Amino acid sequence: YKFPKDFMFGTSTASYQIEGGWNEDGKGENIWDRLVHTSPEVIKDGTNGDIACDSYHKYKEDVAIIKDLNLKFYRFSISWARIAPSGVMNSLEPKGIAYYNNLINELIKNDIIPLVTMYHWDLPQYLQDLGGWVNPIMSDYFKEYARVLFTYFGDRVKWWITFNEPIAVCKGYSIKAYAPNLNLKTTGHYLAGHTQLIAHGKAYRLYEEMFKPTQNGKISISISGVFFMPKNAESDDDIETAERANQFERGWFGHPVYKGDYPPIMKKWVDQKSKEEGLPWSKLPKFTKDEIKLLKGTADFYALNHYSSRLVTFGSDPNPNFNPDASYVTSVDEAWLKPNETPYIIPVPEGLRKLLIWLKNEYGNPQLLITENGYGDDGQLDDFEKISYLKNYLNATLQAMYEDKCNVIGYTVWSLLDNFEWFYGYSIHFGLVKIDFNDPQRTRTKRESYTYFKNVVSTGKP
């Protein structure tokens, strides 16, 4: 198989992970600045995003590399606190707006489509002091932020993602996995998810009413998660468990946006767990009729981030990344493991094929853009395991397209550049391009995977 001529290839970064310039040009403090500066020990290699790839200054070089790759689009995120230091949009910083205008204009003059992520985890700290995403008022603050983005950039930006990986944003509140590094457990988990969903819906409907008539763009939300398969493929029990685990992982966000309301299985299980805990109301908030209508239909394409998969059966998982309200325990198929240190991302290309089918069947075969896929390693230039991962996942994508008729419209490699991998710091290297983080000039060096991907983009053949 090969990718068709009109297939969209791209690459992605995120603001905090590459930009640096963390306190330059009036930029406000965000929750990642706060975390790395006041709890530096939380980053496993003792690093921070103060400088990162210095793409705040080096963005023209980033665009030149994208142009050399001949990519159709570049997915990047906008730092809310560069635009409005407090997160409140009555005080805008023109220098922050200018940076993103400069990047957008650089992309367009090089015939690259900008695909903009509004929120990739860098909440302004003032808004976190209100409680951030577990405070329902945050959806109105997000709506106003989106308004400003559409106003300043929407004449040129026609592809938008509201939220990157809302599940990960939730985990920053619930299980100390990301900024703001709180331990609110499942109660906080669902509060953060609910607010992000309402925020998404408000932004989409605002776009529809106030900007789409003249801008004619598209919006989605990048829904991620570990994909789950039955431990025993012949067990009805395990098949049921996998469906529940999948609905809890990604149906949580997709069901409201595509089908209306939360997944029925989440209502059942969360309401019951809440009763078992003696809580006066369910941990899963209830949408109003009007909110269900607000949210249903708020994606013009399905945006998928995907990395890996696990087997499941009924039980309890010691890893807090797996939602205990769904009562599944994960495992890794022996076939996926090798006699060495386990990679950061365990390659399970069959999982992507099966996930694409799952999404096709659950949501009526929406046009689907893979907004992130990639593999992170020790940063060697001969990154052959990364090449193999990309090749195998690209082939899984082609199988889903041509064998199972999945409406996949594009694919995005995470990432163009090595970058700050959150609590792992620079220690995990996802880049097609190596960055020397010990060099003040943050020198770029192309890896073997760069040439591999360049060739796939040109020929359509993994």
Q: What single string gives the DSSP state of each residue in 375-386?
A: --BS--SS-HHH
- 107: its two tokens: 């992309």
- Which DSSP category does 28 fall into? P
> 180, 126 in Cβ contact below 8 A?
no
Q: Rounded to the nearest 10 degrees, how much is the dihedral formed by the CA atoms of 202, 204, 206, 207? A: 160
HSE-up of 459 (CA within 13 Å, CB side)?
9
> 188, 131 in Cβ contact below 8 A?
no
Residue 17 among known ligand-binding residues:
yes
Residue count (the chain): 462
Q: Residue 369, SS3?
A: strand
Q: Please tell me the experimental approach by which this structure was elucidated.
A: X-ray
Burial of 282 (0-12, 13-18, 19+ CB in 10 A): middle
**Number of domains within the chain:** 1
Residue 194 among known ligand-binding residues:
no
HSE-up of 399 (CA within 13 Å, CB side)?
15
Residue type, 460: G
- Which DSSP category does 280 fall into? S
Residue type, 59: Y
Residue 163: how many other CB atoms lie within 10 Å: 26
Q: Rounded to the nearest 10 degrees, how much is the dihedral formed by the CA atoms of 310, 413, 108, 85? A: 60
Residues 6+ away with beta carbon under 8 Å from 18: 52, 53, 55, 62, 417, 419, 420
> 301, 221 in Cβ contact below 8 A?
no
**Angstrom distance (rounded) from CA 76 to CA 115:** 7
My answer on whether omega of the bond before 339 falls inside 30° of 0, hence cis, is no
**Angstrom distance (rounded) from CA 89 to CA 215:** 21
**Angstrom distance (rounded) from CA 181 to CA 175:** 7
My answer on whether omega of the bond before 415 falls inside 30° of 0, hence cis, is yes
**Residue showing tokens 């790759």:** 69
> Which pairs with CB-CB distance under 8 Å and at least 24 residues apart come from 182-187?
184/134, 186/270, 186/273, 186/283, 186/323, 186/324, 186/325, 187/283
**Angstrom distance (rounded) from CA 329 to CA 316:** 5
CA distances from 290 to 197, 198, 399 (A): 14, 11, 40
Residue 429 among known ligand-binding residues:
no
- 250: its two tokens: 């990604």
- 136: its two tokens: 């329902």
Burial of 14 (0-12, 13-18, 19+ CB in 10 A): buried
CATH number of the domain residue 106 falls in: 3.20.20.80
Spatial strand order of the sheet with 309-314 comes to 227-230, 309-314, 328-331
Instruction: Indicate which residue of 106, 249, 291, 372 is catalytic.
Output: 372
Catalytic residue at 372? yes
Q: Which residues of 387-411 are buried (b: 16+ CB within 10 A; e: fewer)?
A: bebbbbbbbbbbbbbeeeebbbbbb
Instruction: Indicate which residue of 165, 249, 362, 421 is catalytic.
Output: 165
Catalytic residue at 385? no
Q: What residues make up the domain containing 60?
A: 1-462
Residues 6+ away with beta carbon under 8 Å from 89: 83, 144, 145, 147, 148
Q: What DSSP string describes 104-172?
A: HHHHHHTT-EEEEEEESS--BHHHHHTTGGGSTTHHHHHHHHHHHHHHHHTTT--EEEEEE-HHHHHHH
- Which DSSP category does 23 fall into? T
Positive or negative: CA dihedral 337, 343, 349, 355: positive
Specify which residues 304 forms β-bridges with: 223, 370
Strands 227-230 and 159-164: unpaired
| C-alpha 77: how far from chain center | 10
Positive or negative: CA dihedral 84, 85, 90, 96: negative
Residue 164 among known ligand-binding residues:
yes
> 114, 108 in Cβ contact below 8 A?
yes
Residue 57 among known ligand-binding residues:
no
> 117, 164 in Cβ contact below 8 A?
yes
**Angstrom distance (rounded) from CA 58 to CA 442:** 9
- Which DSSP category does 287 fall into? P
